[PDB]
């Protein structure tokens, strides 16, 4: 059975289980069940399923080289699908809440969930909470008897926490750290001294890479009972490397990809985000370019946004991206080679993840 | 050592652990650590600690009648305090997010967290997420070796989910169920046909009673390794009964308690909530009273709110509350008597919880 067919079939099964349980144990009525079905579909479906499918693909790689009864193969793949959906539902939680936090308009070509007329922010915040709860409901139901339950739950909650910490790093990335204070309204930085590679790397590591790469790779190992067979320090290092590249691509696309292809209007410049573009620009600009950037960044004024995009264009940041990408290729290939010492099979799964990420539509 | 002294000492210890771990494992800087310390204090401290202290008091009751080394008593009480703080931090998560959802102004005599000048909704939504994550970080750290870890985590996530489901029941309680639809803006009910005792009871059971009574009572049993010694069906029934009374008191206070004592301005009438007052009023009103209620409920117009408060006053709902309270006393005393068959000690702990709830400042 093709992996994507299995993954989509398991979504339907998990949805039916969750909704049936709301009826049998939580006293839900049919109209509220329908609302939640629609909310689940709208917030969880429509992406590429990169993260959830990585769990499945990692598991498939081990199945190809390990002796198992057919029923065991089916169990492992079903578990990989459920675990993959846990990650997709965790992402859905963060996207619902982030869109509210940021006042975003569109996501994946459609209005953000909170903007649906019959949702509103009042309901959407709580819908996002439900999405997160569903990750645990599905784990306890499907994995109750499994030897990996404890490790999987502990990993999951640490990754969730890291993501929340990363969201804090991201939301505060345009303020001066020494002025942070709940009592005092926060002005945007004027010096941009905290727009550095190391500070950018911290934001991305926590906000993106743990849930986007580390969690699917390690969950794939756990459902395969294979974690002891790899060097975990290498898994962490390769996840953090590929995850940073993924986010750099997203940062470039926010500025330069036409919104019809992006699925949204990117607002990183208006929001004063510490993006790869801003950090890299400030790492090559002359004093006059720095001053013009300071005079225009972080403002909704469309003429000021256009000045920033022109500064970026004239600064030939495409060349910096090419150099960055070439270095990532060197480093990822090196990490894949190291992974082969203890697990050639897992190394190939990572090679596949990297190729997918590298070839992701620019 | 007095129980409250121990509980407050454990807060300081847990806070230090969480913040130290953010520095050692999550790359946090000192200013963001200070923000989170202040956020923790502002959102988690200042209440009565009814819920967290119930874990401690349940554990103390078993210690008084069970043979243990002194070091074991200290471990159990420390565990009860940590578990109690998990509940307090879960509540803090829901209060942060609920205040945003509802546009609330004040909580416990101070501005709601999102209204602090240097917080804002963008940060506060995520701060609430962090509060929830901290409940799991503390459990995995302090309870890693404990036999009750699995049961406690599974209970906790089910209660969290129930609370989210109850929030959905509460937020939608003023709309007609058959019109719920994410695509269509939701009008307030005109018939109020869903303002019934059974529908009210469903809202309260899920939104309040699981986290306010069931979770502290059962967590106290788990940290005491005593759950097998009680009839759990009775624990559920007594939690749901006392929890409903707690919420009825809160509903009355929202309308009639001066805001200086309440700590906020109650807005249930303007928000069209399915409150005990509204349900009970509609259960005794004549046609003219129903019509005037319909003409004024659910509107910010202060003159319309005053009409509703006068309808409530003239309807002698104080007498309905007295009758409701007398029935709760009958039923809670009956459940405490039944609890004595298998656990006289736990029965006394419940009797203490009931007395505290019954005597809670009106
Ligand atoms: O972009 N990609 O191709 C991805 C992204 C995440 C992941 O876990 C695997 C592949
Ligand atoms: O109001 N009260 O006294 C309470 C409330 C909750 C609880 O778990 C114990 C006592
Ligand atoms: Zn964001
Ligand atoms: Zn982006
Ligand atoms: Zn509310
Ligand atoms: Zn209330």
UniProtKB/TrEMBL annotation, chains A, B:
Which residues of this UniProt protein bind Mn(2+) 4?
250, 254
Q: Which residues bind Zn(2+) 5?
A: 236
GO CC annotation, single: cytoplasm
Q: Which residues participate in Mn(2+) 3 binding? A: 250
Binding annotation for Mn(2+) 1: 98, 102, 170
Q: Which PROSITE patterns match?
A: POLYPRENYL_SYNTHASE_1, POLYPRENYL_SYNTHASE_2
| Annotated positions binding Zn(2+) 8 | 250, 254, 268
Where on this chain does Mg(2+) 3 bind?
250
Which is one Pfam family of this protein? Answer: polyprenyl_synt
Which positions bind Mg(2+) 1?
98, 102, 170
Report residues binding Zn(2+) 4: 102, 170
Q: Name one GO biological process term.
A: farnesyl diphosphate biosynthetic process
MF terms per GO, please?
A: (2E,6E)-farnesyl diphosphate synthase activity; dimethylallyltranstransferase activity; metal ion binding
Protein's name according to its UniProt entry: Farnesyl diphosphate synthase
């Amino acid at each position: 059975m093709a992996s994507m067919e299995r993954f989509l079939s398991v979504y339907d099964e998990v949805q039916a289980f969750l909704l049936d349980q709301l009826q049998s144990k939580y006293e839900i009525d049919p109209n509220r069940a329908r609302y939640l079905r629609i909310m689940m579909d709208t917030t969880c479906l429509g992406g590429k399923y990169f993260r959830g499918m990585t769990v499945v693909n990692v598991a498939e790689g081990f199945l190809a080289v390990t002796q198992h009864d057919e029923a065991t193969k089916e169990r492992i793949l079903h578990d990989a699908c459920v675990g993959g959906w846990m990650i997709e539902f965790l992402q859905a939680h963060y996207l619902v809440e982030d869109d509210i936090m940021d006042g975003s308009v569109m996501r994946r070509g459609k209005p953000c969930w909170y903007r649906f007329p019959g949702v509103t922010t009042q309901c959407a915040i709580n819908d996002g909470i439900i999405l997160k709860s569903w990750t645990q409901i599905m784990a306890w139901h499907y994995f109750a008897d499994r030897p990996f339950l404890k490790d999987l739950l502990c990993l999951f909650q640490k990754v969730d926490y890291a993501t929340a910490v990363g969201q804090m790093y991201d939301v505060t990335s345009m303020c001066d750290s020494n002025k942070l204070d709940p009592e005092v309204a926060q002005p945007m930085t004027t010096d941009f001294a905290e727009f550095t590679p190391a500070i950018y790397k911290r934001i991305v590591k926590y906000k993106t890479t743990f849930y986007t790469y580390l969690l699917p790779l390690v969950m794939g190992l756990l459902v395969s009972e294979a974690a002891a067979s790899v060097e975990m320090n290498l898994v962490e290092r390769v996840a953090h490397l590929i995850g940073e590249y993924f986010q750099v691509q997203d940062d470039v696309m926010d500025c330069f990809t036409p919104p019809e292809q992006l699925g949204k209007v990117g607002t990183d410049i208006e929001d004063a985000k510490c993006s790869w573009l801003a950090v890299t620009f400030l790492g090559k600009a002359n004093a006059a370019q720095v001053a013009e950037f300071k005079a225009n960044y972080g403002e909704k004024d469309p003429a000021k946004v256009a000045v920033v995009k022109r500064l970026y264009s004239k600064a030939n940041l495409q060349a910096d991206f090419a150099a960055y990408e070439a270095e990532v290729v060197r480093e990822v290939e090196s990490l894949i080679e190291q992974l082969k010492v203890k697990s050639p099979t897992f190394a190939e799964s990572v090679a596949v993840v990297w190729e997918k990420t590298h070839k992701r539509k620019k």
